[PDB]
Amino acid sequence: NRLYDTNKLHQYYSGPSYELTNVSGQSQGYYDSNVLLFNQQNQKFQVFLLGKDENKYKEKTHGLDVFAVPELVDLDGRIFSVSGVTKKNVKSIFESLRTPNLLVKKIDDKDGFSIDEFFFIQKEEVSLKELDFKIRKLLIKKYKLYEGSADKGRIVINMKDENKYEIDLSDKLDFERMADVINSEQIKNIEVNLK
Amino acid sequence: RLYDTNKLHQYYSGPSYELTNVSGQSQGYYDSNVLLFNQQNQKFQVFLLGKDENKYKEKTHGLDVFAVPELVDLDGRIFSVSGVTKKNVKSIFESLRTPNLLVKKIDDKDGFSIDEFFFIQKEEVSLKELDFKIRKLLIKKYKLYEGSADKGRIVINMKDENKYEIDLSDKLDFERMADVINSEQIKNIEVNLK
């Protein structure tokens, strides 16, 4: 009933992900969706532009990064994923490297905690999709998220200008939010509250 | 025999069009009720020949239409039958719909069973669309109407044990093209080729 929802979340966030870099593409119609196809590595991809990206790559675009997670894989091995597209780094890896604190907490009377987790972001421009997936992946492996221990909660990304991005851990990140992009240099910290 | 098979092949391997989020009201054209649309840069006339006959008397909005040409009139308007449904309210990956698609052929010439999956993007899908896409794929991958695969059936099993059965020997009956199906209720699809 409710446990079935958690099993699917566990399955997805503990599953495969892929980081593609400096990709070139152009959007094309796949029924009533606009998608990007490509073959980096020995894998084939099809990225559905379902959010703010819906109408941005009509002409051939170079220098893209793509964080992909399979929603499904078709019969010829092509991986269907949603958004997760950004511009590649302009500077070198160590110049653009950010290590904001990842604070993981549970404020329960006699079963609580507050732990600083190391977290690093390699990209200058990073999709919320990538942050969401990597953070949950880490929560599943180190805090038993979706394994009958932690089940609900949120991830809060705090920016230097004080705006925040918030994600509810009770369900998968909204498909229409997976195209949101964040300037990693501007992330002040990230806080997770488990319950 | 040979003339019918080729007619089925060109029909099911031929063009189709998908209109999304359209508006309209039915009108008359000779002995039938029809809907007229002008989406993209193409003109259509959909014949409401089944359960849809009087469904669109009032102006209706947010419709999806699966069109296959039965013929193109002198002015270039495409004549198609039914295939009208309500559009999606959620993303195509939400509660993702990939019912199993089993394609079998066990007889003297072959002996196989392939179990793929059919990605149904619409929450509400016409039997017309299912019929057309299944056959289009059978032609392309299993050479239906192209040599050995000439007859057979498509069975769409619903979760409540009810089902839709379609004979591959002929074109889907025009009166069945307005049958709408809740995609989330399809359990599996089984194709038996002979």
Q: Is residue A194 domain-shared with residue A140, that is, in the same domain? A: yes
HEC states along chain A?
CCHHHHHHHHHHHCCCCEEEEEEEECCEEECCEEEEEECCCCCCEEEECCCCCCCCCCCCEEEEEEEECCCEECCCCCEEEECCEEECCCCCCCCCCECCCEEEEECCCCCCEEEEECCCECCCEEEHHHHHHHHHHHHHHHHCECCCCECCEEEEEEECCCCEEEEECCCCCCHHHCCCEEEHHHEEEEEEEEC
SS3 B176: helix
Using what technique was this structure determined? X-ray
Q: Is residue A59 domain-shared with residue A123, that is, in the same domain? A: no
Q: Which helix (H) or strand (E) holds B64?
A: strand B60-67
Residue A133 near residue A169 (C-beta atoms within 8 A): no
Q: Is residue A97 domain-shared with residue A164, that is, in the same domain? A: yes
In angstroms, the CA A189 to CA A179 distance is 21
Among the candidates B87, B107, B136, a domain finishes at B87
User: Residue B20 pairs with which residues in a beta bridge?
Assistant: none
| DSSP string across B52-63 | TTTTTSS-EEEE
Q: What is the largest CA-CA distance in chain B?
A: 55
CB nearest A71 (choices: B20, B96, B117): B96
What's the CATH code of the domain at B180? 3.10.20.120
String of b and e for A124-148 (b: at least 16 CB within 10 Å)? Answer: bbbbbbbbbbbbbbbbbeebebbee
Q: Are A31 and B96 inside 8 Å of each other by CB?
A: no
Q: Is residue B27 domain-shared with residue B107, that is, in the same domain? A: no
Q: Which residues of A touch B91 (CB under 8 A)?
A: 50, 175-176
Among the candidates B53, B70, B87, a domain finishes at B87
Q: What are phi and psi of A155, to 5 degrees?
A: -120, 130
Q: Is residue A115 domain-shared with residue A82, that is, in the same domain? A: no
Q: Which of residues 31-90 of B touch A (CB under 8 A)?
A: none
What's the CATH code of the domain at A65? 2.40.50.110
Residue A71 near residue A80 (C-beta atoms within 8 A): yes
Q: Is residue A84 domain-shared with residue A97, that is, in the same domain? A: no
Residue A123 near residue A86 (C-beta atoms within 8 A): yes
Task: Choose from A30, A32, A83 for mutation: most chain B CBs within 10 A.
Answer: A32
User: Residue B32 pairs with which residues in a beta bridge?
Assistant: B29
| Overall resolution, Å | 2.2
CA atoms A82, A83, A84, A85: torsion sign = positive
Residue B43's contacts (CB-CB under 8 Å, 6 or more residues apart) are B36, B37, B75, B76, B77, B78
Q: Is residue B3 domain-shared with residue B36, that is, in the same domain? A: no
Can you say how many angstroms the Cα of residue B152 is from the centroid of all Cα atoms in its chain?
Answer: 17
Size of the A and B interface in Cβ pairs below 8 Å: 24
Distances (CA, A) of B89 to A8, A147, B124: 22, 31, 10
Q: Which residue has the tokens 């959007």?
A: A27
The two tokens of residue B58 are 């009032």
Orientation of helix B127-142 relative to helix B2-12, angle to 10° = 110
- Which range of residues forms the domain containing residue B167? 1-13+88-194
Number of H helices, E strands in chain B: 2, 15
Q: Are A72 and B121 inside 8 Å of each other by CB?
A: no
Can you say how many angstroms the Cα of residue A2 is from the centroid of all Cα atoms in its chain?
Answer: 24
Q: Is residue B107 domain-shared with residue B168, that is, in the same domain? A: yes
In angstroms, the CA A49 to CA B177 distance is 31
Q: Is residue B98 domain-shared with residue B186, that is, in the same domain? A: yes
Q: Is residue B116 domain-shared with residue B179, that is, in the same domain? A: yes
Q: Is residue B53 domain-shared with residue B126, that is, in the same domain? A: no
The two tokens of residue A45 are 């991809």
| Neighbour tally for B111: CB within 10 Å | 9
Q: Is residue B78 domain-shared with residue B158, that is, in the same domain? A: no
What is the 8-class DSSP label of residue B177?
T
The two tokens of residue B9 are 């092949």
- Integer Rg of chain B from CA: 17
Q: What are phi and psi of B152, to 5 degrees?
A: 135, -165
State the total domains in chain B. 2
String of b and e for A16-34 (b: at least 16 CB within 10 Å)? Answer: ebbebeebebebeeeeebb
What is the 8-class DSSP label of residue B172?
P
Q: What share of chain B is helix, strand, coil (3-state, %, to 5)?
A: 15, 40, 45
